[PDB]
């Protein structure tokens, strides 16, 4: 069969690295047409929903252990922030054909035996009876579950205990002095004000609630608009209707309320923020139905249970949340220590997310734009509730570990009190018994309650050829999925052991593979590997230089933040966060910077200072920020086209946007590119821009930060990518 072939390469002959590879699809999934009931591209799972680190699965353990490649699945149930965008097919007859033993769902890989009266489960080989219902002008082959690898069903009654819940929100806002002064409260209020209609309300049942918190927990009774402020203070930190209300029936009142709040705490001098108590308050406020507690704060919890200093209460809270289907999201914006490392556990184990805004300050107009844009997109994001996810494997395969934000204790089931749209997840697979078939399969199932009072079950079925050829296993390895695998193992290692241990784990992942390939597969002295794993060494090396794993000094909050982001980022954004897209703008092609409303972007250059001409203009996009680097020797014409002036020392410095320079088509093109890199319908990230000038203190600090993004270069005591490869070669030698 067309088993993907091994394409040997010499890593030393490919420098700079062919970074265009970061954008190629993974190796093909060699499945002949006969194995699929209705052959088509939709008959096997798309890499967008699931990506196996191995697209040619080792037929047995000893071979898996010998490959030294990991077996993991990058799973992402949703592709966009809004469900109306490119949804999978949706079944509605309520018929759900499932195996009696394993419980796997009918899929494109089952085999109909005995005149099509029964089907043999492809996961456990059990013979099952085909319901007469599967044939009621279309036949069973016109059905999605048989035509598509990724499809969805409307769940029957037995898949529900209680009636689908409404999308419930509880904004727990920090109204302490730090919040007032910084403008976080103002910005938070104004944003809610400007997006009440952005919040999902597909069934008109969406419910909201607002808790303002300082040293006491301030509540608000919101009457129905039709029957036209009641602030109920509670200072006893040891201690529903009209508190959690209809966004629709109280639209004007919620608006009236949010408008007054800023004035209420306008002159607050209290510096207390009792997160613990408030959190328990919100818990009881929505626990009877479940929902999201969205915390906005710029002040370290310092009063009541759960206070922190420069705690396990939170972990216990997440355990309780898993009992009442509550998710917690956090927006931490402050110049002071916030202990993202501790607070991020709230979101982490409740399927929520934490967003960190270092040095946030209203005094900086650009700080407002970033916080607002993200907070707005985040609250507008669709999501599920009471969801659970699991992956079933065919005989011999077993899910062993689960990574990402959700709740999982001693099962193979991942609980999502609410399932967001902007995250990714990873499952490690183990091959126990030897596989006997030429194919093995993996099926991910999501039993969910959509934010439209509907019960659904989303299925993702993946089929992979088995092989005994170690060479074939390597030729079908998904480098980006693998990078992601080790990225999660590294986060675990760090978060539970040490940063250094995590570095050791990252570098080892590369050495073992390079060592294995060299000895397990048959010139001068090259560093051998295959084409599909060509970017792996570079990705792991670059990972060791990421702010999340770097050696040396990195502020506590930044670090925790970076770790939290790398662990939940969608593959696409993960690879870019590790290795950045760098654009050479001064010698930009004429197409670039202009429409094809989507703008065309220049081709990315390698992430190295070797290419930064002193007279050039470069734009760096690392998924977190955008750096506009202008060479200290830029010709006045260039400095002009971009900022209006001809003096390069007069340019804007730091966190600032590019000015609108009239009659400069070049300035428009630069603005187009930036705006293009800023729009995503799958994540909420708004990337602030930092303008840096090439070669008073701030300028040095920025050059330093921007420079650190060029992960191919040497930094302090971390070698360059070139040297890294040399080191590895020396290590796998005798």
């Amino acid at each position: 069969r067309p088993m993907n072939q091994l394409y040997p390469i010499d890593l030393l002959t490919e420098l700079p690295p062919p970074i265009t590879d970061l954008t190629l699809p993974p190796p093909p999934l060699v499945i002949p047409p006969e194995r699929m009931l209705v052959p088509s591209e939709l008959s096997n799972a798309s890499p967008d929903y699931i990506r196996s680190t191995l697209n040619a699965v080792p037929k047995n353990s000893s071979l898996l252990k010998k490959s030294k490649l990991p077996f993991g699945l990058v799973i992402r149930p949703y592709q966009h922030l809004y469900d109306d965008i490119d949804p999978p097919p949706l079944n509605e007859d309520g018929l759900i054909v499932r195996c009696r033993r394993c419980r796997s769902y009918m899929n494109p890989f089952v085999t109909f035996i005995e005149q099509g009266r029964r089907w043999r489960c492809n996961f456990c080989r059990l013979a099952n009876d085909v319901p007469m219902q599967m044939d009621q002008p279309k036949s069973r082959y016109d059905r999605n579950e048989i035509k598509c690898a990724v499809m969805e069903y409307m769940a029957p009654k037995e898949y529900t205990l209680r009636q689908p819940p409404p999308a419930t929100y509880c904004f727990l806002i920090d109204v302490s002095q730090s919040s007032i002064k910084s403008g976080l409260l103002a910005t938070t209020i104004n944003t809610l004000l400007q997006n009440l209609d952005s919040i999902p309300n597909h069934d008109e049942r969406t419910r909201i609630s607002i808790l303002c918190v300082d040293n006491a927990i301030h509540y608000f009774k919101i009457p129905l608009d039709s029957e036209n402020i009641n602030m109920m203070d509670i200072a006893d930190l040891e201690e529903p209707n009209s508190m959690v209300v209809s966004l629709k029936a109280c639209r004007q009142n919620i608006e009236t309320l949010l408008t007054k709040i800023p004035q209420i705490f306008q002159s607050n001098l209290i510096t207390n923020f009792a997160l613990g108590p408030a959190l328990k308050s919100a818990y009881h406020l929505i626990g009877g139905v479940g929902g999201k507690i969205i915390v906005v704060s710029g002040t370290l919890p310092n009063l009541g249970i759960g206070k922190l200093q420069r705690d396990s209460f939170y972990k216990n809270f997440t355990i309780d949340c898993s009992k009442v289907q509550i998710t917690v999201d956090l927006f931490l914006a402050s110049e002071d220590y916030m202990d993202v490392a501790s607070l991020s556990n709230l979101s982490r184990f409740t399927a929520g997310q934490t967003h960190f805004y270092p040095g946030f300050s209203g005094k900086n107009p650009n700080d407002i734009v970033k916080f607002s844009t993200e907070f707005a997109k985040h609250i507008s994001m669709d999501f599920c509730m009471e969801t659970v996810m699991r992956a079933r494997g065919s005989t011999g395969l077993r899910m062993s570990r689960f990574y990402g934000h959700f709740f999982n204790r001693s099962s193979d089931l991942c609980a999502f009190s609410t399932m967001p749209r902007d995250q990714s997840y990873l499952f490690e697979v183990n091959v126990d018994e030897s596989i006997m078939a030429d194919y093995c399969y993996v099926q991910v199932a999501v039993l969910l309650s959509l934010n439209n009072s509907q019960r659904r079950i989303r299925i993702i079925t993946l089929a992979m050829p088995t092989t005994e050829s170690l060479a074939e296993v390597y030729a079908s390895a998904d480098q980006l999925a693998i990078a992601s695998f080790y990225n999660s193992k590294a986060v675990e290692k760090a978060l539970n052991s040490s940063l250094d241990d995590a570095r050791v784990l990252i570098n080892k992942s590369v050495q073992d593979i390079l060592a294995t390939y060299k000895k397990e597969i048959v010139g001068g002295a090259p560093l051998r590997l295959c084409a599909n794993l060509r970017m792996f060494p570079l990705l792991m090396h670059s990972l060791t230089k990421h702010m999340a794993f770097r050696s040396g000094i990195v502020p506590s909050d930044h670090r925790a933040s970076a770790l939290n982001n790398l662990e939940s980022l969608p593959l696409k954004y993960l690879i870019k966060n590790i290795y950045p897209d760098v654009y050479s703008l001064h010698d930009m092609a004429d197409e670039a910077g202009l429409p094809v409303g989507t703008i065309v972007l220049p081709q990315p250059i390698n992430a190295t200072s070797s290419l930064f001409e002193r007279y050039g203009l470069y734009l760096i996009d690392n998924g977190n920020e955008l750096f506009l680097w202008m060479g200290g020797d830029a010709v006045p014409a260039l400095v002009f086209d971009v900022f209006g002036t001809q003096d390069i020392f007069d340019i804007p410095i730091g966190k600032q946007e590019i000015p609108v320079v009239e009659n400069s088509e070049f300035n428009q093109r630069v603005r187009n590119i930036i705006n293009q890199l800023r729009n995503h319908d799958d994540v909420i990230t708004y990337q602030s821009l930092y303008i840096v000038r090439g070669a008073a203190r701030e300028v040095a600090t920025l050059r330093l930060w921007a420079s650190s993004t060029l992960v191919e270069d040497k930094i302090l005591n971390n070698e360059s990518y070139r040297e890294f490869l040399q080191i590895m070669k020396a290590r796998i030698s005798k």
């Binding site: 002071d336 220590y337 270092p358």
Partner: peptide
């Protein structure tokens, strides 16, 4: 921890 958008800020 004094936070700054730039992690390299003194």
């Amino acid at each position: 921890t004094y936070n700054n958008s730039n992690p390299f800020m003194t």
